[PDB]
């Protein structure tokens, strides 16, 4: 028994979006459903659930007259649409159901979908800017200005220890900048080369950055 | 409606350890209806315990759950390689339904200074509109540390934002880089930069810094 969700979606704000949880097995008849959502680096935060013994969908007071959680006439798939978005409302989403429908009268939430990711943004797909940040020793690539996510970086790709990639921040500006950085011995510079491998795949991007020492 | 409160935020414990982890409720819960649930980076919650005290099937039992009233309590017995993550518990005797913030178990080990590294904006970068500096704190634990800006000596807010790994699966640290971002005419109009760390790792706190140009 899994719980298959949609797939990510980019949105604009003051849209709306659909995500669907489908059972791979049983219903959702006896127990319901609930939705879930994370904004990112934060906790889990209730949106909603249906209850089936009171034949009630709950939601929470944030969201409600701009959310509904319904279901499929089988009650196999269930959808949390939310609309008037905004870019607050950028999450990953959970559905959750109960093993039981495949005391505790409620849906215990032991059968979890993978989570869809929500960005809203009002941003267009962007490739990134790749600077590299010149120097045991440190030295990285900054990857800035690219939407939406994910960029991948290594450094071809023998070079591996000391390696540490970012997590991507958000700017206010809408789109996304992270570095990689790696720390080297002081000895090896100009008897070593060292470049970064970046890839933005939604943009047709692929970058490869020399990294060499600032000699003045 | 009902606050649910976890501490500590961070439970810092070698592996064995026993972790005890706390959830208060702001009213009375009834204990039919308070869950505790797992979370692993990029990957799903998952229930660990339901009715305060049931867990979930096939989760292990050095997992469990005690408490009634307002007081809840997750214990693991010991703490396996896979159970360092974020436990969260739940309350749904009431709607809405409410979350505590969440309690990291991390690794605990000694105390390392960071390594400081600033980067001025790339001469590349220069040619752009946007200057952006680069401050590096590298292996360092514990997760704990202030990054401050100067631009000449004014303290800067509002302009930076900073971003950490994961604990490193082999030596436990943490590594931050802080990135402060400026218009290129901005940065033109100042000439000293500096990064101002703190860390319980350092005497005193350190600072590196360049003048542009």
């Known amino acids: 028994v899994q719980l298959v969700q949609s797939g990510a979606e980019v949105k604009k704000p003051g849209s709306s979006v659909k995500v669907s949880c489908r059972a791979s097995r049983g219903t959702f008849s006896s127990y319901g459903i609930t939705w879930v959502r994370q904004a990112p680096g934060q906790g889990l935060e209730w949106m909603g659930g249906?209850?089936?013994?009171?034949?009630?969908?709950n939601y929470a007071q944030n969201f409600q007259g701009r959310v509904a959680i319904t279901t499929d006439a089988e009650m196999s798939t269930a959808y949390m649409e939310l609309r008037s978005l905004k870019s607050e409302d950028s999450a990953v989403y959970y559905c959750?159901?109960?093993?039981?429908?495949?005391?505790?009268?409620?849906?215990?939430?032991?059968?979890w979908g993978q989570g869809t990711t929500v960005t809203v943004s009002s941003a267009s797909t962007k490739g990134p800017s790749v600077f590299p940040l010149a120097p045991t020793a440190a030295l990285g690539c900054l990857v800035k200005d690219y939407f939406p996510e994910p960029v991948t970086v290594s450094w071809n790709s023998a070079l591996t220890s000391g390696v540490h990639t970012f997590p991507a921040v958000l700017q206010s500006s809408g789109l996304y900048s992270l570095s990689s950085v790696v720390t080297v011995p002081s000895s090896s510079l100009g008897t070593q080369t060292y470049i970064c491998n970046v890839n933005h795949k939604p943009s047709n991007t692929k970058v490869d950055k020399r990294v060499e020492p600032k000699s003045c | 409606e009902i606050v649910m409160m976890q501490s500590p935020g961070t439970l810092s414990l070698s592996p064995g350890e026993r972790a005890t982890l706390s959830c208060r409720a702001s009213?009375?819960?009834?204990?039919?209806?308070l869950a505790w649930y797992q979370q692993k980076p990029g990957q799903a919650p998952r229930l660990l315990i339901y009715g305060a005290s049931s867990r979930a099937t096939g989760i292990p039992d050095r997992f469990s759950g005690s408490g009634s009233g307002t007081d809840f309590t997750l214990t693991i017995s010991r703490l396996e390689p896979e159970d360092f993550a974020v436990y969260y518990c739940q309350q749904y005797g009431s709607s809405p339904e409410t979350f505590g913030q969440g309690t990291k178990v991390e690794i605990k080990r000694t105390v390392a200074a960071p390594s400081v590294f600033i980067f001025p904006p790339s001469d590349e970068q220069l040619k752009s509109g946007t200057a952006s500096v680069v401050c590096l704190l590298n292996n360092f634990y514990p997760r704990e540390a202030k990054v401050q800006w100067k631009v000449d000596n004014a303290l800067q807010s509002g302009n930076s934002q900073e971003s950490v790994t994961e604990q490193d699966s082999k030596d436990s640290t943490y590594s931050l880089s802080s990135t402060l971002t400026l218009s290129k005419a901005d940065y033109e109009k100042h000439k000293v930069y500096a990064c101002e760390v703190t860390h319980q790792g350092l005497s005193s706190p350190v600072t590196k810094s360049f003048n542009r140009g």
């Open positions: 009213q009375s819960v009834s204990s039919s209806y």
């Open positions: 959750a159901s109960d093993s039981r429908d495949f005391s505790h009268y409620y849906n215990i939430m032991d059968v």
């Open positions: 249906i209850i089936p013994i009171f034949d009630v969908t």
